């Protein structure tokens, strides 16, 4: 990427130390000692397709948990929003890094063409499946 590994350590430092601000609260109230340790991240989702589960993980945190837990206790909320932002910055550093319009140009005729080139689409799903199968 754009000489990205020169930034990675500092970004991880920013995520850990930013999290530390709210850790004292949530860790102190998560008393039921459930042991889900998210084992799967490295032992699963590797290879290629599994990875995207971690991109889904990122979006899971940013949307699913951040603005609900933000109101879970409302008085101190900047501490959790700045953490969601601080992981969104890493998602953006994934889009650029390692991890149709011309159709939409003619809307009125592409409706016909997209449903007249379907046989060639079949021929090509056949063609590149015959690559994806041998290797």
């Amino acid at each position: 990427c754009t000489h990205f590994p020169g930034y990675l350590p500092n970004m991880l430092r920013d995520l850990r130390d930013a999290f530390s601000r709210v850790k004292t609260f949530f860790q102190m109230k998560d008393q039921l000692d459930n042991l889900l340790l998210k084992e799967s991240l490295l032992e699963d989702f590797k290879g290629y397709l599994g990875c995207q589960a971690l991109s889904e993980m990122i979006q899971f945190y940013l949307e699913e948990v951040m603005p609900q837990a933000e109101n879970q206790d409302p008085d101190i909320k900047a501490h959790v929003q700045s953490l969601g932002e601080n992981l969104k910055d890493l998602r953006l550093w994934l889009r650029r890094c390692h991890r149709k319009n011309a159709f939409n140009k003619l809307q009125e005729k592409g409706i016909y063409k997209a449903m007249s080139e379907f046989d060639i689409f079949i021929n090509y799903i056949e063609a590149y499946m015959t690559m994806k199968i041998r290797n």
């Binding site: 000489h3 020169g6 930034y7 350590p9 500092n10 970004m11 920013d14 130390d17 601000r21 940013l62 949307e63 951040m66 603005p67 900047a78 929003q81 700045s82 969601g84 932002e85 601080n86 992981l87 969104k88 910055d89 890493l90 953006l92 550093w93």
Partner: protein, 183 residues
């Protein structure tokens, strides 16, 4: 609703403060907001300050931030100037400092960087940019791996700046620090 204009945002060492010169005219004072591209919610991040220049140093230093802003009367909305930032790239580099020698028979300068004004912890610009390497250029010279050690009585004298290997960039020079030549 004469809006504020002529935005100049000064990001030297990540103090992301803007300035728009809020107008004191009849329709130019009442409330305005500075919404941001929050991770998803897209929330507000400052209330009305008579000075349009709300500080936003809180913004992160490696991502990018939308500066979606508005201004409005109770019954009318004013204009706005959405400068998108990416403080790591879209910023100025401060003037370096130095640790300085007093020996006449041989001068030395231990170089020193600008420091980020982080309320929670302490950081140095060198930390942020991993390939930092100073450039001292005066009457061209280039600093030794880390620091400078050691002529006719010439008043042409040191200046120092930050430099980056691949993103060739220059902070403001540390020009004032003249050196004492000697017999």
């Amino acid at each position: 609703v004469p809006p504020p204009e002529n935005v100049r945002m000064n990001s030297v060492n990540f103090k992301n403060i803007l300035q728009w010169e809020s107008p004191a005219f009849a329709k130019g004072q009442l409330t305005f907001t500075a919404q941001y591209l929050s991770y998803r919610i897209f929330q507000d991040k400052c209330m009305q300050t008579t000075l349009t220049e709300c500080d936003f140093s809180s913004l992160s230093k490696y991502g990018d931030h939308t500066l979606r802003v508005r201004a409005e009367f109770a019954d009318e909305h004013s204009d706005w100037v959405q400068i998108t930032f990416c403080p790591v790239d879209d910023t100025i580099i401060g003037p370096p400092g130095m640790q300085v020698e007093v020996l006449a028979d041989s001068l030395h300068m231990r170089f020193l960087a600008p420091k980020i004004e982080n309320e929670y912890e302490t950081w140095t610009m060198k930390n942020v940019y991993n390939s930092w390497t100073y450039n001292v250029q005066y009457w061209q010279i280039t600093p030794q791996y880390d620091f400078e050690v050691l002529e006719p009585w010439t008043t042409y004298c040191v200046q120092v700046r930050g430099f980056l290997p691949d993103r060739n960039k220059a902070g403001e020079w540390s020009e004032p620090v003249c050196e004492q030549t000697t017999h």
